[PDB]
Amino acid sequence: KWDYDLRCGEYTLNLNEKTLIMGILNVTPDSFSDGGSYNEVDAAVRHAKEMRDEGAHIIDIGGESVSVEEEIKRVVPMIQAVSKEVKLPISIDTYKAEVAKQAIEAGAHIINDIWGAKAEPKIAEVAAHYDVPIILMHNRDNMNYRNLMADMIADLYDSIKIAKDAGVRDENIILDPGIGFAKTPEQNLEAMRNLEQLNVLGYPVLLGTSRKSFIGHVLDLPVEERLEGTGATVCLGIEKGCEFVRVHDVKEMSRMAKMMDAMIGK
Amino acid sequence: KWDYDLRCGEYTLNLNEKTLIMGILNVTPDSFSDGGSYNEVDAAVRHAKEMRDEGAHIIDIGGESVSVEEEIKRVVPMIQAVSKEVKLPISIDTYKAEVAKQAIEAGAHIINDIWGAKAEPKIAEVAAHYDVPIILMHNRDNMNYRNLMADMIADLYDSIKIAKDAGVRDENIILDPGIGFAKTPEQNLEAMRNLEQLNVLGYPVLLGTSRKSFIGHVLDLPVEERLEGTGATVCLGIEKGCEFVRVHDVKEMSRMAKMMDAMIGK
Numbered sequence A, B: 001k002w003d004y005d006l007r008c009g010e011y012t013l014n015l016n017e018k019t020l021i022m023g024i025l026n027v028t029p030d031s032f033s034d035g036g037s038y039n040e041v042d043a044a045v046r047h048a049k050e051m052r053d054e055g056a057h058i059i060d061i062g063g064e065s066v067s068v069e070e071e072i073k074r075v076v077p078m079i080q081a082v083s084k085e086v087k088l089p090i091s092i093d094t095y096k097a098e099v100a101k102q103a104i105e106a107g108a109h110i111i112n113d114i115w116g117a118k119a120e121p122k123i124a125e126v127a128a129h130y131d132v133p134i135i136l137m138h139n140r141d142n143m144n145y146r147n148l149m150a151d152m153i154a155d156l157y158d159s160i161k162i163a164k165d166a167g168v169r170d171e172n173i174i175l176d177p178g179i180g181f182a183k184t185p186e187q188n189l190e191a192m193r194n195l196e197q198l199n200v201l202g203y204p205v206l207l208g209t210s211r212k213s214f215i216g217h218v219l220d221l222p223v224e225e226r227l228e229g230t231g232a233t234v235c236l237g238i239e240k241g242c243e244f245v246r247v248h249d250v251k252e253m254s255r256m257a258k259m260m261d262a263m264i265g266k
């Protein structure tokens, strides 16, 4: 059903047997340091440890939510520690070219770019050079669509043409609808409801909805009260064919994914 | 989209605006009494109270999991108390004709028959007489299918012809795939995966998967560790068009339902 595996250095991720879980590494910095101090790096390692024990297949590590050089000095020790101590592929959640490059150098395995190569096109180049999967998220500086889904597909397509023109092999491309970016609450709902359309593009799809505003908007609930909303988006996502979910609650979300997988026959 | 409402005496349930939540009333009897003693009836009222506060639209009350007359003496006080104190329609989960009749008399609003009129055909008759919705679950005394879904649809059809021949109006008929009855673990999965087929029959569908074996079978987890599995089945159910879910965890399941509803545009 997917004629290839996701190549990630020492680890390989099958795309057919299960929905793969990307665990969001929570990266609480030291108000007292700029580097890789014991507390932040240790909390980070503990948290990746726990997400590994809970069912996570990938650990996702982000720098900013803010100069370039800071982002590295912050993010790089996190990667060296987690990669050394947790045997799962790490993805680096940055859009900056220099950041991606350091992170890979430091041991990151996948690039994760919330601007799908548009904020910093050199990033495709890095991806190309190190031969790593890169995630291209849908994003843009405006909410003005003539047709959300057709535009979303258009915009994503633009990211692929950037990735490809830079040397990126089809098999290293992953797409993501960027739910929660550049979309109104109702537009997010509509992307959800049409997610399967992304499949015509022929690439694996990652969905990132964990705890976002639009769940709050529907359910009327704070971020920490959004587990069941997230759950629904994960389920609907998997039914609609997505291959990855990006999630805070690895334990719960792993179980829902596993049950969906058995239902839909994945 | 449904050209009618569910008529239930003093209450009316719209079938278009949301997935309706049926809360499973947990009915822990007194090892010391046969009637309507303070503890069992009071725990029951408290539990229906809490499920009402959590988002339940219907309260479902069951007698046995066991003579006929016992079932009544047990179930009837439960209905009088809950109906008097909780303003939600109550359904009576029995297949026995005499039981259904007492329950309605006592104040039950919907019949809920895990043998869809086949164990006790007079039950359709009762339903007909009091003009109440009756749920017809798929069931049978064997697991031998030539084609699960086609047979399931066949068997269900047999229940409708019994309900109809007894006077039951189309608008009072609800169907249910009976996941967890007369099916192997893998067969349950396959019913799940083909639930939408039930819609060709033209009746509203209730799904009852809460905490059942097959979730345990997939996830490898005790009944009390089955919330996320249940969740997935609820989501997949709602996406596949079902109008009701029958669930233990009313709070969590209400939220998932609400989020699904907003996604699928219900």
Ligand SMILES: Nc1nc2ncc(COP(=O)(O)O)nc2c(=O)[nH]1
Pocket: A024, A093, A112, A113, A114, A135, A137, A176, A178, A179, A180, A206, A207, A208, A209, A210, A212, A246
């Ligand atoms: N690939 C991908 N990356 C992302 N990074 C950050 C956030 C938003 O930040 P948060 O998860 O920390 O709220 N969402 C995404 C997403 O949806 N997809």
Ligand SMILES: Nc1nc2ncc(COP(=O)(O)O)nc2c(=O)[nH]1
Pocket: B024, B093, B112, B113, B114, B135, B137, B176, B178, B179, B180, B206, B207, B208, B209, B210, B212, B246
């Ligand atoms: N309509 C309907 N009624 C039911 N009654 C009992 C049980 C199984 O008992 P439990 O819910 O107490 O485990 N399942 C159903 C069902 O799936 N649908």
